[PDB]
A paper describes a structure:
However, for these theories to be broadly applicable, they need to be demonstrated for large and multimeric enzymes that catalyze complicated reactions. The enzyme used in this study is a type II DNA topoisomerase (Top2) from African swine fever virus (Asfv), a dimeric multi-subdomain enzyme (271 kDa) that catalyzes multistep reactions to modulate DNA topology. AsfvTop2 has been found to be involved in the early stage of viral gene replication, and also detected at the intermediate and late stages of infection. The domain composition of AsfvTop2 resembles that of the canonical Type IIA DNA topoisomerases (Top2), including the well-studied eukaryotic counterparts, which form homodimers.
Furthermore, these primary conformational states are each sub-classified into two conformers, a and b, exhibiting local differences. The distribution of the three primary co-existing apo-conformers is approximately 1:4:2. Even though such differences are modest energetically, they do suggest that the closed state II is the most stable state, followed by the C-gate open state III and then the open state I. These thermodynamic properties are reflected in their structural properties described in the following sections. The changes in the Ia/IIa pair are mainly in the closing of the DNA-gate via the WHD subdomain. Conformers Ia/Ib were aligned globally with two apo-yeast Top2 structures. The results from the preceding section suggest that, even though the global conformation of apo-IIa is very similar to that of EDI-1, binding of DNA/inhibitor still induces small subdomain reorientations, yet coupled with substantial catalytically relevant conformational changes locally.
Author numbering:
A (entry chain B), B (entry chain A): 716 to 1192
C-alpha cells in the first residue's frame, strides 16, 4: 500500500546522502518519483504517521528518524506540527539492517506505463506485520491490531534458524500439526500495567496510587491504546458517574504522568454495594475505565491480491518464514551466479594481457571472420555493464543475456591496463571473488535452508540498531 | 569601454547557439560574466543603443540583430520599448566576418582578480572607429563625430592590400609625406540631400519641394543627424519667425517622409529683402533650418591608456592599418607554430602503432629509467590538451610549455586506436595538416605584409554580409 511507496521513496531520496530534508520537500520527492497523486496533505499525513514515535503508537519504531514533535499520546498523534517547517530524516541504520539492500534487487516488482513501480510486498529480516499496531493512512476505515512482545518472535525465528537451539526439531514438529508449542503474548514495552487473559480474550489495566495519609489518589499508568482526552470524555459521559465524581483535574503530560484525583473518604464506603462486586477487578478500578477488551483484527496482504484472515498470530508467523526463507535462497544463488560471471571476465582480461603485445598478436579483430577465431582462442563473448554492474535481473534471465553478450569489454581498454602493475591488481582481485565464491559455495548447502548463518548475523544487526536508537537521544551517532 | 564588454558577452552567450534571447536576460548574462555593475538600466540602454538601427543613428549597422522597434529618427532612439518584453539577437553572420573568431584568441587581454577581462582594443577587418558616429553610452557627456562614406575606406584598404591595385606604391608613397592623395568624404547612405565643402568645414542640406500649381510646399529630406522634434522646436524658438509662419503641421513618419507646408504667396516677395540675400543658399532654405555645420571630434582609444586627437581622418586610418597588419602576421605565425606541434603528435602516435604490439615492445614504461629509453626511441614528451585544443596562448609561451610537456598522450589510448582501420584515419589526417602547413608556408612571405590574400577574402566576406542584411527583411536567412 502507501506504506511501501514512502519507504522506497525514502531510501531512494537518501541513497546518495542522508541529510535533513523538509517534509514538504520529501513529500513532493516521493510523489514525483512514483506519481502518487492521492493528495500532498494525505501523503504528508501518512509520512508523519509512518515517522511518528510516541508510547502506544501504531508503529513501535518509526521508519524514519523523528525530528521535532510529530505527535503525542494525549491526542493520538493528531497534534503534528506544520510539515512546511518541520523536517524528516531517513533511519539509515535500522532500514539497512532491517531491510537488506542487496535483497531489494530480487523483490517481485510490478511495471506500469513502462516504468518501475512499488513491489507487491516487502520481506524484511523480522515480520513487520506483527510488531506494529493498526493505523489509518487513509480516512474513514481504521485498522486496529495488537502487537506481540519483542521476545517471543525472536525465540521463534532463532529456533527456526540457529542449529544449536534445543527447540529446533520440536518447532519444526509443531508446524505440521499446528500445535504452536511456543508462546505468543502481546507487547509490554512502555506499559506499566498488567496483562491478564481469560478464555480467548486479553485485557489491559492501568495503575493507580491511593495514599491514606494524604487522602490523595494518584494516577500512574494510562491504558495501552486510548487517547488521554478520550479517557477524560469517557468518564464524563455517564450521568450517574457525575454523582460519584466531585473534582477531576487533568495533570497528564508528555514523558511525565502524575495526576492527582480528589475523592472524599465518605464515598468509598458505598461504592461496592451497587456495582455487583465484580470478582475480576475491584470497584476502585472498575469505576474508572481502565480495562480494554482485545479483539484482534488479524490480516495479511495477499500475494495474489486481496486480504486474508487468520485464526491466530501463529498462522501469520508460520506463513511468513517460508517467504523470507526462499529469499535467502534466491539472494545466495543469484550472487553465486553473477560472481562466476565476474570470475571469467577478470580471468579473460588477464589472459588477454598474457596474449597481448608481450606474447601474442590478434590485431585483425574482424567482425565475422575473426568471431570463430576468437572463439577458438577461448575468449568469452560476454557483454559488460551487466556483470560489472548488476541490476534488477533474476537468475534465469541473467545467464541468457550474459552468455549471448557483445564485445568491447576487450580490445577497447586503456593501453595502461595491460601493464604488469595493472595486471597485478587484476590477478590479486580474481582470487578475492574466487575466495568469496568459496564462502558462498560453503553456504546454500545446509540441510534446513540456505543462508542460515547470515540470518543470525542479520538478526544481531537488527538488535544492535534498536539498542543504539533507544540508548542515545535518537541521534544514532 | 562598455561597447567591447557587450560584444564579448554577446558572442560568448550565443557561442553554443544563436537564438532569441530577452534583453533583460541578455543584459543579466552580460553583467554576470564580466561583473559589470554600472546599472542594469544603463547596461540595457547601451545594449539598445548598440543594437539600434535607424537612419542617421550613431551605429550605421547594429552589432546585434534588431528585433522589434528599438527607436526612431524623430526622437533619436529615445523611444525604445520595454527591455523586459523585447528580445535581442546576435548578428552571427556579420560579427564572424567582421571580427575574426580565430584572431580573438590573440587579442591583448587584461586580467583582474585572477579572471579574464575585456581586451584593451578590438581590431576588426574594417576600422569601426570611422564608420560609426558618436554615441553616449553614459550620461552627461555626448560624443559627436561624422562617419566617412563606405567607398573611400574600401579603396584605401584594397590599395594597401591587393597587389594588382594601380595606386599601391603611390599609397605607400603618401604615407611617408602624409600628403593623403586618396579622397575621404562623409557618409551619404540614407541621406537624400547635398554635401558641400568650404575651407575645412562641411555642411548638409535638406530637400524641399515647391509646387506652383497647387501652392503647397512639400518637405522631402530631413538633415543628417538632427531629431525631427528638434527641428520643429528650432523653427518655433525665434520670435520674429513666428510672424513669417502661418501654419506648420508635422507629417513626418517612419520610412515615409511627406510633409505639407502652407505658405501664402504674399509672403514670398519680401523674404529676400531683409535676410541679406545669402550667396551660399537661397532664403527659402535659409528661413528653415536645413544647414548643419560640421566640427568633427576625432578621437581614438590610446593603447597605453587615454585619449588622442588627430588633425584629419587620414591620421586615424593611417595608424589603424599597422595594428591590423601586425595581427595578420601574428595569427599566421601562431597557427603555423601550433600546426607543426600537431604534426609531430600525430606522426608519433602513428609511429607508436608501428612500434606497437604488431612489431616492437616497450611495455616497461618506467618513470625515470625509461624516460631516457623513450628519449632514444624518439617519442616526443609533449603534453596533450594544449596542442589538440589551443587556448589564449601566444607564440613565445606556446613552445615553452609544449616541449616541456608530459606523457599520457601515448600508452594510454584505446586499444582499438592501434588497429589498421584506426591507423588509416590517422595517416590520412597527418597529410591534411601537412598540406595545410604548405598553404601557410606559402603565405607569411609576401613582400608587403603576411596574410595579404586572406585580407582580401575577409573584405569580400564583410561585403557579402552587408549586402545580404540589406536585401532581406533583416532576417539573414
Amino acid at each position: 500500500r502507501a506504506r511501501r511507496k514512502i519507504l522506497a521513496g525514502g531510501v531512494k531520496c537518501f541513497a546518495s546522502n542522508n541529510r535533513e530534508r523538509k517534509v514538504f520537500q520529501f513529500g513532493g520527492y516521493v510523489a514525483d518519483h512514483m506519481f502518487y497523486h492521492h493528495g500532498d496533505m494525505s501523503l504528508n499525513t501518512s509520512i508523519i504517521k509512518a515517522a511518528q514515535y510516541y508510547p502506544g503508537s501504531s508503529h513501535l519504531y518509526p521508519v524514519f528518524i523523528g525530528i521535532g514533535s510529530f505527535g503525542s499520546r494525549h491526542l493520538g498523534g493528531k497534534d503534528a506540527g506544520s510539515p512546511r517547517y518541520i523536517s524528516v530524516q531517513l533511519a539509515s541504520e535500522f532500514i539497512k539492517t532491517m531491510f537488506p539492500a542487496e535483497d531489494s534487487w530480487l523483490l517481485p516488482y510490478v511495471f506500469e506505463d513502462g516504468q518501475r513501480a512499488e513491489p507487491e510486498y516487502y520481506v524484511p529480516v523480522l515480520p513487520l506485520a506483527i510488531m506494529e499496531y493498526g493505523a489509518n493512512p487513509s480516512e474513514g476505515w481504521k485498522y486496529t491490531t495488537w502487537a506481540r512482545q519483542l521476545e517471543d518472535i525472536l525465540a521463534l525465528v532463532r529456533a527456526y534458524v540457529d542449529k544449536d537451539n534445543p527447540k529446533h526439531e520440536l518447532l519444526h514438529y509443531a508446524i505440521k500439526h499446528k500445535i504452536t508449542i511456543l508462546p505468543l503474548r502481546p507487547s509490554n514495552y512502555n506499559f506499566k500495567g498488567h496483562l491478564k487473559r481469560f478464555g480467548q480474550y486479553y485485557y489491559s489495566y492501568g495503575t493507580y496510587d491511593i495514599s491514606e495519609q494524604r487522602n490523595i489518589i494518584t494516577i500512574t499508568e494510562l491504558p495501552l491504546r486510548v487517547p488521554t482526552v478520550a479517557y477524560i470524555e469517557s468518564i464524563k459521559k455517564s450521568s450517574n458517574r457525575m454523582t460519584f465524581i466531585e473534582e477531576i483535574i487533568d495533570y497528564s503530560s508528555s514523558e511525565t504522568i502524575e495526576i492527582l484525583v480528589k475523592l472524599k473518604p465518605n464515598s468509598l464506603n458505598r461504592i461496592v454495594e451497587e456495582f455487583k462486586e465484580t470478582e475480576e477487578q475491584d470497584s476502585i478500578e472498575n469505576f474508572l475505565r481502565l480495562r480494554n477488551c482485545l479483539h484482534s483484527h488479524l490480516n495479511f496482504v495477499k500475494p495474489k491480491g486481496g486480504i486474508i484472515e487468520f485464526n491466530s498470530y501463529y498462522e501469520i508467523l508460520y506463513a511468513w518464514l517460508p517467504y523470507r526463507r526462499e529469499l535467502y535462497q534466491k539472494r545466495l544463488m543469484r550472487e553465486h551466479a553473477v560472481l562466476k560471471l565476474r570470475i571469467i571476465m577478470e580471468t579473460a582480461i588477464v589472459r588477454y594481457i598474457n596474449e597481448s603485445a608481450e606474447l601474442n598478436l590478434s590485431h585483425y579483430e574482424d567482425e565475422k571472420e575473426a568471431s570463430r577465431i576468437l572463439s577458438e582462442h577461448g575468449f568469452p563473448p560476454l557483454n559488460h555493464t551487466l556483470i560489472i554492474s548488476p541490476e534488477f535481473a533474476s537468475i534465469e534471465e541473467l545467464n541468457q543475456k550474459a552468455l549471448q553478450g557483445c564485445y568491447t569489454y576487450i580490445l577497447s581498454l586503456q593501453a595502461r591496463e595491460l601493464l604488469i602493475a595493472a595486471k597485478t591488481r587484476r590477478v590479486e582481485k580474481i582470487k578475492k571473488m574466487q575466495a568469496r565464491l568459496d564462502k558462498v559455495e560453503q553456504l546454500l548447502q545446509e540441510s534446513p535452508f540456505p543462508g542460515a548463518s547470515v540470518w543470525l548475523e542479520e538478526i544481531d544487526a537488527v538488535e544492535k540498531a534498536i539498542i543504539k536508537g533507544r540508548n542515545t537521544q535518537w541521534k544514532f551517532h
